[PDB]
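Researcher: Let's do a round of design. I'm pasting the structure tokens now; please hold your answer until I've finished.
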């Protein structure tokens, strides 16, 4: 698709790669399971759960992941695979994550919402 804005300022946005298996979206408090691939805006991959083969699990809306993931995954339907542009103020801000993410990074993510409970 073309870019779909998620945040009010439209700077957090996604393109749907694969439409979901249903129209269901996860409520806050859901323990969601996702597969993801993270890249810098150069296209350089820094992390992927597919390399490990284990989905990543977090509780939606708790603020225990970056804001762009809480907002972005809330926008997803069950089974959806989408591509997100996540500005630094929706990610790690001015922080570096040593060995992973340079300071002040826009992050790109492919995220597949596998399931939740």
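Researcher: That's everything. Go ahead.
Model: Designed sequence:
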């Amino acid at each position: 698709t073309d870019w779909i804005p998620i945040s009010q300022d439209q700077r957090l946005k996604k393109k749907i790669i694969t439409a979901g298996s249903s129209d269901e979206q996860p409520p806050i408090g859901s323990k969601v399971s996702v597969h993801y691939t993270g890249t810098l805006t150069s296209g350089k991959k820094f992390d992927s759960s597919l390399d490990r083969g284990q989905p990543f699990v977090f509780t939606l809306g708790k603020g225990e992941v970056i804001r762009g993931w809480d907002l972005g995954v809330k926008s997803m339907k069950k089974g959806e695979k989408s591509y997100f542009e996540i500005p630094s103020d929706y990610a790690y801000g001015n922080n570096a994550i040593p060995g992973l993410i340079p300071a002040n990074s826009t992050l790109m993510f492919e995220i597949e919402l596998l399931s939740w409970k």
